[PDB]
Design an enzyme around this catalytic site. Structure first.
Site, mmCIF file in Angstrom:
data_model
loop_
_atom_site.group_PDB
_atom_site.id
_atom_site.type_symbol
_atom_site.label_atom_id
_atom_site.label_comp_id
_atom_site.label_asym_id
_atom_site.label_seq_id
_atom_site.Cartn_x
_atom_site.Cartn_y
_atom_site.Cartn_z
ATOM 1 N N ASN A 1 39.362 25.355 7.544
ATOM 2 C CA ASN A 1 39.997 24.536 7.434
ATOM 3 C C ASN A 1 41.483 24.674 6.800
ATOM 4 O O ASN A 1 42.419 24.339 6.921
ATOM 5 C CB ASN A 1 39.345 23.498 6.465
ATOM 6 C CG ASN A 1 38.185 22.439 7.076
ATOM 7 O OD1 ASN A 1 38.451 22.557 8.296
ATOM 8 N ND2 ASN A 1 37.385 22.074 6.502
ATOM 9 N N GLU B 1 30.299 29.219 6.608
ATOM 10 C CA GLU B 1 31.122 29.984 5.431
ATOM 11 C C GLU B 1 30.218 29.924 4.150
ATOM 12 O O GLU B 1 29.956 28.551 3.777
ATOM 13 C CB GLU B 1 32.586 29.341 5.266
ATOM 14 C CG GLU B 1 33.437 29.131 6.404
ATOM 15 C CD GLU B 1 34.585 27.979 6.236
ATOM 16 O OE1 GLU B 1 34.487 27.019 6.178
ATOM 17 O OE2 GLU B 1 35.476 28.824 6.158
ATOM 18 N N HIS C 1 29.012 26.001 3.399
ATOM 19 C CA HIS C 1 29.836 25.080 4.424
ATOM 20 C C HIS C 1 29.445 25.354 5.823
ATOM 21 O O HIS C 1 30.096 26.133 6.556
ATOM 22 C CB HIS C 1 31.310 25.563 3.956
ATOM 23 C CG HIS C 1 32.384 24.691 4.873
ATOM 24 N ND1 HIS C 1 32.336 23.101 4.693
ATOM 25 C CD2 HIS C 1 33.245 24.868 5.659
ATOM 26 C CE1 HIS C 1 33.514 22.686 5.574
ATOM 27 N NE2 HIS C 1 34.013 23.745 5.941
ATOM 28 N N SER D 1 33.721 19.917 1.819
ATOM 29 C CA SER D 1 35.042 20.533 2.378
ATOM 30 C C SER D 1 36.019 20.101 1.590
ATOM 31 O O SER D 1 37.237 20.480 1.775
ATOM 32 C CB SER D 1 35.160 19.819 3.721
ATOM 33 O OG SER D 1 34.170 19.919 4.876
#
Lengths: 296, 283
Positions: free
Chosen positions: A203, A165, A153, A132
């Site tokens: 995010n 993702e 992800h 991340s």
């Protein structure tokens, strides 16, 4: 899941390097979905911890099924026999078709792990990170074949969270990317596609929204609890921003936003929050410590 | 609601100036909650379409009675003469609103509370002309007013403690969940949501991810009932653009408020979202 699985005849054996919460969750869903898994970590204690957690979780799910008690424990042992552990990375990845790194968020350690991986894996192996915190370009910078690298992800708890993702670096080949999309779908996830941009989709949009909320509170414009109520009630969100940040982890949010602030120093949106900084410096990390913005 | 209503013995009559969609919806819930309402607009046609829409909603004696509480007036001066609370829901033009308040000031009772529902201007800019700035505040409802539970109750630097307490009671008396905010651009909701939507547009514009993958990521990753492009279409692209334009002009050094091409094109083209059958998506 099958439409995908049966279109990846090339991908049968998966190695996961790093045995913490995400690595163990990825190992669980990969095995449950029919692939062979090798979970690797030099830390034997971590390997043992992961296999007990996986075994628990798989057993737990079986209890929901209909069927004889034999039908159920049969289900658990079929799944668990697809998972093997190994305390040596080079050994672990030798017959892997896909390798997923889930190690500590430290770029030098990850690059070291990838050098070990590429020294030992098969020539056509696809290599991936779950990070991340770093760009895929920066993780892959030392690799010989950048065209077989991408990102996967997931979200914690991996067995429960549907979204995945799937990221391409600038160098990922079309063929490698398509394989990664099929693998996410084979393991039961709803994939979304993103380039190698900071924060991918979730995010990048969520963490700055939370920081904007914190900032609103820090200017003195409205209280934390009114902010949260306005967003649940005005936009239907199931958690206001402060509850959300507590849920994600404050340390988790600060660390990501800190890496953005430093790499992208001219971007106003990424400035750190005096108040987040002060709460993490105090070990008030959110739910997982019983205390962040709120207490639990 | 009653706990609020019976602590506002002084507030019986509410005037609403501007009979568009928000003024008409505020008229409806204020009438429904027990107050007398005067709905004021200089455009007689608008007043006519507002009373037809309202009665239409409320049907869905109770209809007659609810209606008997709403009178109309095409004269803003005389409409507010007996009002305890006046709520301005006029078009989003700052000279027009200041002129309205110049009119209201000249006619209203000296203890009258004056408020605006605006999403586009600072309270202190709306009120800049006023002799008693302390009885001024903001009542920011959301469309459709009869359904939307939230109400942001806004104070300026001059709003007195007494005026603000009355505004919070009013919100509560009319069935709303109030939240307090200072006079900052976007209050709480729009300030957080409109830039999150533009962040989403920017991500699509940079070519990082598709519109439908961005919306799907936010629903599944954050549990949001609509993703950002769906939500913008719901709110209205023209509405999101117009508020953000206001911010970009007023706060020119703030990177987050910078305009978007895709957005400008979709609005310049009349593709305004659900309300026109096309925005980001088709309907």
């Amino acid at each position: 899941m099958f439409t995908a699985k049966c279109a990846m005849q090339n991908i049968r054996n998966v190695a996961i390097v790093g045995s913490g919460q995400m690595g163990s969750g990825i190992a669980q869903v990969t095995a449950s979905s029919g692939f062979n898994v090798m979970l690797a970590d030099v830390n034997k204690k971590a390997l043992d911890r992961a296999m007990k957690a996986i075994s628990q979780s798989v057993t737990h799910l079986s209890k929901k099924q209909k069927g004889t008690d034999k039908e159920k424990s049969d289900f658990v042992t079929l799944t668990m026999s697809r998972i093997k552990t190994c305390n040596n990375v080079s050994t672990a990845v030798a017959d892997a078709d896909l390798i997923i790194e889930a190690a500590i968020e430290n770029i030098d350690l990850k690059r070291g792990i990838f050098a070990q991986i590429e020294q030992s894996c098969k020539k056509d192996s696809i290599l991936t990170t779950n990070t991340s915190s770093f760009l895929l370009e920066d993780v892959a910078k030392g690799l010989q074949d950048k065209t077989r690298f991408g990102g996967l992800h997931f979200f914690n708890p991996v067995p429960v969270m549907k979204l995945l993702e799937v990221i391409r670096s600038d160098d990922t080949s079309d063929e490698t990317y398509a394989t990664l999309i099929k693998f996410g779908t084979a393991v039961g996830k709803t994939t979304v596609a993103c380039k190698d941009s900071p924060g991918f989709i979730v995010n990048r949009l969520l963490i700055p929204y939370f920081f904007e909320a914190a900032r609103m509170y820090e200017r003195g414009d409205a209280s934390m609890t009114d902010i949260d109520e306005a967003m649940k009630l005005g936009a239907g969100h199931p958690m206001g921003p402060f509850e959300l940040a507590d849920y994600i982890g404050l340390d988790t949010v600060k660390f990501v936003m800190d890496g953005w602030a430093a790499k992208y120093p001219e971007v106003q949106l990424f400035e750190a929050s005096p108040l987040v900084d002060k709460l993490v410096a105090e070990g008030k990390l959110g739910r997982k410590t019983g205390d962040g913005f709120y207490s639990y």
